[PDB]
C-alpha cells in the first residue's frame, strides 16, 4: 500500500504538472490496470477523456484496455461513445466492426456497418461492408449495399 500510494502520488503529480501530455495518463491508467484496479483505471481514462475529448489514440487505448480484461459490454459502450464523438475517424469504425466480428455477432457487425453507411463514408468502408456480406454468403443484401 505504501508503494501504491507513492506511485499514485507520483502519477498524480505528473498529471497536475503537465496534463496535456497523454503519456502521463497512459502510464497511470496502465499501472492501475496492473494491480487490477479497474474502477481506478476507468476513472483515470475518463479524466483523460475530459482533458482530451477528441484524441483518437486515447479512445483506442481505452477500448483496448477494456477489451484485454474481457470487459466486453463496457468496451462496446465505449466504442459506441467513440463513434458518437468522432464519426469521421474511420479507425474507430474499423476497430468497432473488427471487434464485433471477432466475437461472432454478425447482425451486430451489420448494424454497426449500417450506422457507418448512414454517415456516408469513403469507398473503403463500402467495400469492407460488401466483403463482410460476401464472406458469409448473403449476396442479395450485398446487392442493396451496391445500390
Amino acid at each position: 500500500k505504501e508503494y501504491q500510494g507513492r506511485k499514485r502520488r507520483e502519477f498524480e503529480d505528473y498529471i497536475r504538472r503537465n496534463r496535456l501530455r497523454l503519456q502521463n495518463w497512459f502510464q497511470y491508467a496502465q499501472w492501475e490496470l496492473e494491480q487490477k484496479e479497474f474502477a481506478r483505471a476507468r476513472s483515470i481514462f475518463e479524466r483523460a477523456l475530459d482533458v482530451h475529448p477528441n484524441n483518437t489514440q486515447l479512445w483506442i487505448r481505452y477500448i483496448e484496455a477494456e477489451l484485454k480484461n474481457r470487459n466486453i459490454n463496457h468496451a462496446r459502450n465505449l466504442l459506441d461513445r467513440a463513434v458518437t464523438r468522432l464519426p469521421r475517424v474511420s479507425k474507430l469504425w474499423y476497430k468497432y466492426v473488427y471487434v464485433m466480428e471477432m466475437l461472432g455477432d454478425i447482425p451486430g457487425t451489420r448494424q454497426v456497418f449500417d450506422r457507418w453507411m448512414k454517415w456516408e463514408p469513403d469507398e473503403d468502408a463500402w467495400n469492407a461492408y460488401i466483403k463482410l456480406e460476401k464472406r458469409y454468403g448473403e449476396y442479395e443484401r450485398a446487392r442493396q449495399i451496391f445500390a
Binding site: 496492473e34 494491480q35 487490477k36 484496479e37 479497474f38 480484461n69 470487459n71 466486453i72
Partner: peptide, 20 residues
C-alpha cells in the same frame, strides 16, 4: 462485469505480478 471487476480487485495477489 462490475461485480467481476470487484471480485478481481478483492482477490488480487502481488506474487505473479513481479514476473513480466
Amino acid at each position: 462485469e462490475i461485480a467481476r471487476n470487484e471480485w478481481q480487485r478483492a482477490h488480487f495477489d502481488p506474487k505473479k505480478q513481479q514476473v513480466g
